């Protein structure tokens, strides 16, 4: 009569456009459409919201998608995964969404040569620029590893010691930290840009 363990749901906000809470219900001996419900703490509305867009993986629910109008950043997100055939098998998680925001990868990588010993890299991230920090990796075709540099809300990196006879490669990614949140996972890497020959 002991209730079975439930899968753990992983929620992530992607560029404050939507939220994907996903789980893997392939552990069940009998397959079941697990149901998702959610609400917010420090909120006078004591109402439980059912999932509006379930995600399916082989005819069984494998997650839920919340639209932007359903996301309350900076309010504690309580998500409840429940077994419909047995309501006693339920699990609730309390999440802080400001630490689970994942922005898109930086876009529009441009290089601008100011002098023969100074060139700058520029990018934009489809996101409030003052809420993102950035990491710039670069390497030449004669470098064994990468070279990273942290860039703040100013989206400008100046290449130290430019060598015109070497071909460079640049990539940048962003993270929702630390001014507007405390996220730990970075965004995906941007497409690589190149310079020189």
């Amino acid at each position: 009569a002991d209730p079975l363990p439930l899968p753990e749901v992983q929620c992530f906000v992607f560029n404050v456009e939507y939220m994907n809470c996903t789980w893997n219900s392939s552990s069940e001996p009998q397959p079941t459409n697990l149901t998702l419900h959610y609400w917010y703490k420090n909120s006078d509305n004591d109402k439980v919201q059912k999932c509006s867009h379930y995600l399916f993986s082989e005819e069984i629910t494998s997650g839920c998608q919340l639209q932007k109008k359903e996301i309350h950043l900076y309010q504690t997100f309580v998500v409840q995964l429940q077994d419909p055939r047995e309501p006693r098998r339920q699990a609730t998680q309390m999440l802080k969404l400001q630490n689970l925001v994942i922005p898109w990868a930086p876009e529009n990588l441009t290089l601008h040569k100011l002098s023969e010993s100074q060139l700058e890299l520029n990018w934009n991230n489809r996101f409030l620029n003052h809420c993102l920090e950035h990491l710039v990796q670069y390497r030449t075709d004669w470098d064994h590893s990468w070279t990273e540099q942290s860039v703040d809300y100013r989206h400008k990196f100046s290449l130290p010691s430019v060598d015109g006879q070497k071909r460079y490669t640049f990539r940048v990614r962003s993270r929702f930290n630390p001014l507007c949140g405390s996220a730990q996972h970075w965004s995906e890497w941007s497409h690589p840009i190149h310079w020189g020959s």
Partner: nanobody
Amino acid sequence: QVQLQESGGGSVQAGGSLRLSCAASGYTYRDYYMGWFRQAPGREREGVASIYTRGSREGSTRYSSSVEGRFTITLDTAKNTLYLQMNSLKPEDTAMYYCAADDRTWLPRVQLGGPRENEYNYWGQGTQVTVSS
């Protein structure tokens, strides 16, 4: 859509006190964030204080470092009126004070200091505060 209208401004000697009022009207059920901004003569507008309306007064307020411990922002949910108690006013507080309200629960917001201007959709007309020695 909310409609804000400030009041309670004036000209006060240095060290005096003041209390602004900003009555909200319209769709006051969906404005989750409210704040106060001020604009000094010839200078850009800056955030003073911010508050989350539906919290339980548990860390739901944020103030600028320039007014911390001197200004307090409150909210009367029954009358739909925002307040900003101002004490120990110095001449640097002379500015045009605006209240603002926002309905975007998903919007990122600065968690250190006064509110940014981009974090609010609806604004009031303003009230003038003049502090002289």
